[PDB]
Design a protein around this nucleic acid. Structure first.
Ligand SMILES: [Mg+2]
Ligand SMILES: [Zn+2]
Ligand SMILES: [Zn+2]
Lengths: 65, 94, 258, 152, 48, 55, 280
DNA sequence: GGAAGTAGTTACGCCTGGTC
RNA sequence: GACCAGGCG
């Protein structure tokens, strides 16, 4: 849905890094280099950013009022 | 941290350390093992869900020191070790 | 004696060597850092109106996961019994846009989100999100929200690679690539294992006798990372004081028994 | 094994007897202590399945030794009552006492039990035949002589 | 009894009484479906 | 005289049922014991008033 | 984790792993009987027949419908309803949540049926945090329930600082012969380390040899085994532990939706025997 | 003896929903 | 209440 605030495994905060990672990867930079620059060294943290889906945009359209 | 004695035979003390977990229990038993006068010391969590915070100990000494003395000395050594590591850490970080 | 030597001191993490200490005390220090040191985290939220797509439970959990700065001087963080001070973080956000953690207010200047760029919810046109979030001290052993950070250690080992080994220079170059401190002699090359040194597939045939590891007794390479709630040095100091107080409480109860 | 349950979503029904006669009938005739031996083949149906067997092999196999802390912890975990450890079998390069897995396993056997048999780990029948030949001569072989010819 | 109601297709509020009005419809877009709105009262939620 | 499993079960059940209806316990029992446990204690001690008849 | 059971991390659950919400939609229709004898949406007075406790109507509004976002527990009513008398005062036919189900009222809608009667749908959402007994599965057919929930400080950790979110017994691997799960763990670790997802197509996917070589070049053991430490005692395990990233999915067979207990209750009219079903 | 007919069975629970 | 369908072990 929306990017998790913390890594499920070790609790490192990765909420802010997702949008930077997405824009840098779309810019054409190497994903490994981007993830290293962001500070995610453990592959548990890299799993959180690499496998996340922004589903909030696709469901914001329907309101419950 | 409540102590709930279960057995008080000669040179044997079995008790529940209510309020703790593996963290303190393991440190206590491993620092008790190095005492030459202790013949058998161990601990166990009877159930991870029901007795998660009630470790159970068995302290058996040869007889020259009572198990209460052994636990007192072990806790004193734990406190001294923690203080020394704290001093070293504060010296290094500063 | 007991020696502490710092390898790499970063802003959000520290890597140090702990020497002259049994494995039990290292594991106890790691466990106390993980689950004893207290921090501030949102434990209860009062929602006045939430028109967003996320439910109240989801937003409350995301608020609880948001790290909060923990003042050190005002509160006794090494006490066995925690204080009941409650910080009221409020939010009055509406209209199109995305709500960040920097939009939260606070009744206490000290307690506030460390990172103001953490997304909370994406709001559409006309949606309003109003709540007052209450934070209190707690321990990571109860819920993961109160965990100060992350911590782990490993054995301080020196890997011996015999110089009689053909193409040992490739192993030396690999050790240099990984950044591990490496020393070489006339008969062998020693690779201090600051980080996990794993022998490649080609050299696995020598893993038995020609190349072998040597565990330095009572030495561990620790790695403590903070989430911004507390300084890492403060985390380690508070954990050590927690262990000291636990030992003191055990001594007092034991004396009470006799 | 008696229930054929495998913890992959299994559900089991629990019935509470209500009359004292029914409770006595259940507790005397149907308790799980009994029914260890199967009426089908006269053999044990309640026994170790996977981890018990594999851990037993890792314990009692050749060259498997354990440190004092491990021995005390495993004995306390198993529930075995004990106030003194047996004499260690080996000594480490640092002088640390080490216990064999066979001694730890023997700590929980009846003091009168005596039996011999070949298990599934027999790959060289010559060693088993040598052990049987040693046993058949007097039925009470010298323990050190058996330890010389010990086989997995 | 006058009760506050929210339409389905449009989010703007509609006022009527179900017991009296035989026919329920938003009198602006002709929508037969309505939302009972969330009362403006505090709600206490535990963040766990 | 060796009781079978079924004879033992019937004797213990009848004794527990009697105890639950006010029949005095023939031994001393710990407080809080359920009537079935009292009957089992009675049988283990050996004071068994009920006798089984066989053809 | 013996016998296909699964061991899971408490800290991972508390951070959102495998969290889910369950939705149920109750329906109440204002039925129009013959002769103009209609039923009414209202909070019934205690003078009506079949009246439940006055506590069960705590969240109801004067209209007869429960306010949204109001916490509702078992047996609490959502649509207070009274029907014309047919006993041989108005009978009660209100709609309440199922006896074993709780939650929060997410949405209350009001509408009109095909024939013209009023119809209301109430949706209740219940937060289901994973607990013991919930069924988890992988894409390779390894079903299992949570046998234990272990704190993070009790979980083993790797020399690289990796803590498992889940532990599976090795005894379930060889009897099932799922080498694909091990290859998927290797591929998941390689994908996380690379920052590029691994192609696992049926016959043109990345070969296992390439994945092992890439894992070797990334700085890890090619076998996927890593040196692990025991959380409880603090010493490293004797064997190198196989660890990786596997895509696990939580199934809808939750233990909260299956537990059932009946001391005594309703019976069938014909046979006087207990009724059938968890719902009744 | 056929050569067709006829009848009688074909694991045990459990859960969900939907329509009569 | 009995019919159907889908699942679970
Ligand atoms: Mg099964
Ligand atoms: Zn992580
Ligand atoms: Zn409208």
């Amino acid at each position: 849905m929306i990017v998790p605030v913390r890594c499920f495994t070790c609790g490192k905060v990765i909420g802010d890094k997702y949008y930077e990672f997405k824009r840098r990867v779309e810019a054409g930079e190497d994903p490994e280099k981007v993830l290293d620059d962001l500070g995610l060294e453990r592959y548990c943290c890299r799993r959180m950013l690499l496998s996340h889906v922004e589903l909030i945009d696709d469901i914001m359209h329907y309101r419950v009022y | 941290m409540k102590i709930e004695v279960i057995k008080k035979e000669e040179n044997l003390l079995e008790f529940y350390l209510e309020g703790e977990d593996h963290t303190f229990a393991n440190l206590l038993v491993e620092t008790l093992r190095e005492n030459p006068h202790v013949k058998f010391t161990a601990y166990t969590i009877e159930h991870p869900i029901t007795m998660a915070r009630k470790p159970r100990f068995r302290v058996v000494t040869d007889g020259e020191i009572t198990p209460e003395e052994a636990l007192e000395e072990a806790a004193k050594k734990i406190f001294e070790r923690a203080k020394e590591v704290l001093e070293a850490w504060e010296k290094a970080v500063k | 004696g007991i020696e502490v030597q710092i390898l790499e001191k970063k802003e959000d993490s520290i890597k140090f060597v702990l020497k002259g200490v049994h494995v039990s005390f290292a594991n106890a220090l790691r466990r106390t850092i993980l689950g004893e040191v207290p921090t501030f985290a949102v434990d209860e939220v009062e929602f006045y109106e939430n028109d967003s797509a996320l439910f109240d439970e989801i937003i409350a959990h995301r608020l609880a996961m948001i790290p909060l700065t923990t003042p050190v001087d005002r509160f006794e963080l090494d006490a066995l019994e925690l204080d009941d001070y409650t910080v009221t973080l409020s939010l009055e956000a509406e209209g199109p846009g995305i709500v960040y953690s920097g939009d939260l207010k606070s009744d206490d200047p000290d307690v506030k989100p460390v990172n103001p760029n953490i997304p909370i919810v994406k709001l559409a046109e006309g949606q309003r999100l109003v709540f007052n979030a209450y934070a209190k001290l707690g321990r990571g052993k109860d819920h993961a929200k109160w965990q100060p950070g992350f911590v782990y250690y490993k054995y301080y080992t020196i890997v011996h690679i015999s110089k009689s080994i053909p193409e040992w220079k490739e192993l030396k170059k690999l050790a240099k690539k990984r950044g591990l401190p490496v020393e070489e002699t006339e008969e062998e090359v020693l690779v201090t294992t600051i980080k996990p040194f794993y022998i490649p597939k080609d050299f696995e045939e020598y893993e038995g006798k020609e190349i072998w590891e040597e565990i330095v007794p009572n030495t561990y390479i620790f790695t403590v990372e903070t989430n911004g709630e507390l300084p890492v040095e403060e985390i380690v100091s508070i954990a050590l004081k927690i262990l000291m107080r636990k030992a003191d409480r055990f001594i007092s109860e034991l004396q009470k028994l006799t | 094994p008696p229930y054929n349950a495998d913890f992959d979503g299994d559900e089991m029904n629990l019935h509470v007897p209500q009359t004292e006669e029914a409770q006595a009938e259940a507790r005397i005739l149907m308790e799980v202590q009994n029914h260890i031996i199967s009426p089908r083949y006269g053999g044990p149906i309640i026994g170790g399945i996977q981890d018990h067997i594999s851990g037993g092999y890792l314990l009692t196999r050749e060259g498997a030794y354990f440190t004092r802390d491990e021995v005390e912890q495993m004995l306390m975990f198993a529930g075995v009552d004990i106030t003194e450890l047996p004499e260690p079998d080996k000594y480490d390069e640092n002088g640390n006492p080490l216990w064999s897995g066979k001694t730890i396993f023997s700590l929980l056997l009846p003091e009168d039990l005596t039996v011999w048999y070949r298990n599934k780990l027999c790959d060289e029948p010559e060693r088993c035949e040598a052990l049987e030949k040693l046993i058949e001569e007097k039925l009470m072989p010298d323990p050190e002589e058996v330890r010389k010819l010990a086989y997995d | 009894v006058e009760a506050v109601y929210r339409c389905f297709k449009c989010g703007r509020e509609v006022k009527l009484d179900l017991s009296i009005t035989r026919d329920l419809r938003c009198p602006y877009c002709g929508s037969k479906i309505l939302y009972k709105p969330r009362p403006k009262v505090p709600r206490r939620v535990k963040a766990i | 005289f060796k009781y079978t499993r079924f004879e033992k079960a019937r004797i213990i059940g009848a004794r527990a049922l009697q105890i639950s209806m006010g029949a005095p316990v023939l031994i001393d029992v710990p407080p809080g014991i359920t009537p079935l446990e009292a009957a089992i204690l009675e049988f283990e001690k050996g004071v068994i008033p009920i006798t089984v008849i066989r053809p | 984790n013996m016998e296909d059971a699964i061991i899971i991390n408490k800290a991972s659950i508390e951070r959102g792993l495998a969290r889910s919400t369950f939705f149920r939609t109750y329906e109440a229709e204002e039925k129009k009987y013959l002769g103009g004898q209609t039923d009414k949406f209202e909070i019934p007075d205690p003078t009506v027949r079949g009246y439940r406790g006055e506590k069960y109507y705590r969240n109801l509004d004067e209209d007869g419908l429960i306010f949204p976002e109001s916490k509702v527990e078992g047996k609490d009513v959502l649509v207070g309803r009274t029907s014309p008398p047919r006993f041989l005062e108005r009978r009660e036919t209100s709609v309440a949540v199922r006896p074993s189900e709780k939650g929060v009222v997410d949405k209350v809608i009001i509408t009109e049926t095909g024939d013209g009667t009023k119809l209301v749908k109430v949706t209740v959402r219940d937060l289901r945090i994973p607990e013991l007994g919930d069924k988890f599965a992988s894409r390779h057919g390894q079903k299992g329930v949570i046998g234990l929930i272990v704190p993070q400080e009790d979980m083993p950790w790797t020399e690289s600082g990796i803590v498992p979110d889940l532990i599976v017994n090795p005894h379930g691997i060889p009897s099932r012969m799922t080498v694909g799960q091990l290859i998927e763990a290797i591929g998941g670790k390689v994908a996380s380390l690379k920052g590029r997802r691994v192609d696992g197509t049926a016959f043109i996917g990345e070969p296992e040899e390439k994945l092992r070589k890439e894992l070797e070049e990334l700085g890890f053991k090619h076998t996927g085994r890593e040196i692990m430490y025991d959380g409880i005692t603090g010493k490293r395990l004797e064997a190198d532990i196989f660890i990786g990233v596997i895509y696990y999915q939580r199934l809808h067979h939750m233990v909260a939706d299956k537990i059932h207990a009946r001391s005594r209750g309703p019976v069938q009219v014909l046979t006087k025997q207990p009724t059938e079903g968890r719902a009744r």
